[PDB]
Structure 1
Amino acid sequence: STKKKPLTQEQLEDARRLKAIYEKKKNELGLSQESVADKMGMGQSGVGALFNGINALNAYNAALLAKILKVSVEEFSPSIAREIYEMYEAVS
């Protein structure tokens, strides 16, 4: 319905990429979805939604997660990385 909009195919692949990085690294980083949520100031279901392709990433959340997982945003979402780069061109 009207309340929530489904993600594009591209947003879906971005989420699969993100969740795989999280799985590969949650051990070495000592993470949990609940700790990630805390770091971001949301609950486990908010993070679960991003990881599972229910809610889409925005530039801000993507940047935060990249930092938490210690990767660059482009390793999961090249398109958001590029939107972030184009915004940067307006500051620099």
Structure 2
Amino acid sequence: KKKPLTQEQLEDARRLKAIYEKKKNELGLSQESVADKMGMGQSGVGALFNGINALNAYNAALLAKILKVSVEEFSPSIAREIYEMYEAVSDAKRIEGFTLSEEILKSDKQLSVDAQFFTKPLTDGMAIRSEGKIYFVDKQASLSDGLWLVDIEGAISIRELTKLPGRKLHVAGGKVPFECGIDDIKTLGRVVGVYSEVN
């Protein structure tokens, strides 16, 4: 028959068409050049772009790969569907990502990590990439001796802490270890896992 595209598919097509017309020259693609990649004809490509045929998860997956974008960039609904379907194979956790350069923390792309990486249910957590390593930080953990993502007077660095009597601390990890009170250091989270490449 003919179904009229329930107006989220219609607006998804508009973003998809807009995200293609401005990047076809960037990638040297045409509607037939995309038709061959999907195993279709040019008639089928224009239907998806001009909001005549409703695209599915498979087509959205390939269309995102052809344009090297995310389905979120043109269809946030299916990306929710993709994440929901991926909860069946393995509950990979979408951890917000950060970068630590010059002791400065900046938000970055969210990071996908399987729940098997962690021995505890990391609900509020971060993923900081620094010095060729990725540090997985538990934002809600009790203060104890261990590896912590701390802040010392406007500088963020990974340091190993050791509680001392008299409400003092021992900070290790920097080029020079030192001691100070527990309130001289702001704790942003406890490091629970470290990933690194060949060193």
TM range (shorter): over 0.9
Residue 46 of structure 1 and its aligned partner are, at CA, apart by 0.3
Q: 1:31-86, CA deviations, whole angstroms, 9 ceiling, x for partnerless residues? A: 00000000000000000000010000100000000000010011000000000100
Q: 1:1-54, CA deviations, whole angstroms, 9 ceiling, x for partnerless residues? A: xx1111011111000000001001000100000000000000000000000100
SS state at 1:31 partner: coil
- 2:68 is matched with 70
Q: Distance in 1 between matches of 2:3 and 2:74?
A: 21
Q: Distance in 1 between matches of 2:18 and 2:41?
A: 20
Q: TM-score, normalised by structure 1?
A: 0.95
SS state at 1:57 partner: coil
SS state at 1:42 partner: coil
**What RMSD over aligned residues (CA atoms) do the two structures have, in Å?**
3.1
Q: Distance in 2 between matches of 1:90 and 1:78?
A: 20
Q: Distance in 2 between matches of 1:55 and 1:22?
A: 17
Structure 1 stretches (4+) deviating beyond 6 angstroms?
none
% identity of equivalent residues: 99
The match for 1:35 among 24, 33, 36 is 33
Q: TM-score, normalised by structure 2?
A: 0.44
* Bigger radius of gyration among the two: 2
Structure with the larger helix share? 1
SS state at 1:54 partner: coil
Q: Which runs of 5 or more structure 2 residues have no equivalent in the other structure?
A: 90-198
Structure with the larger strand share? 2
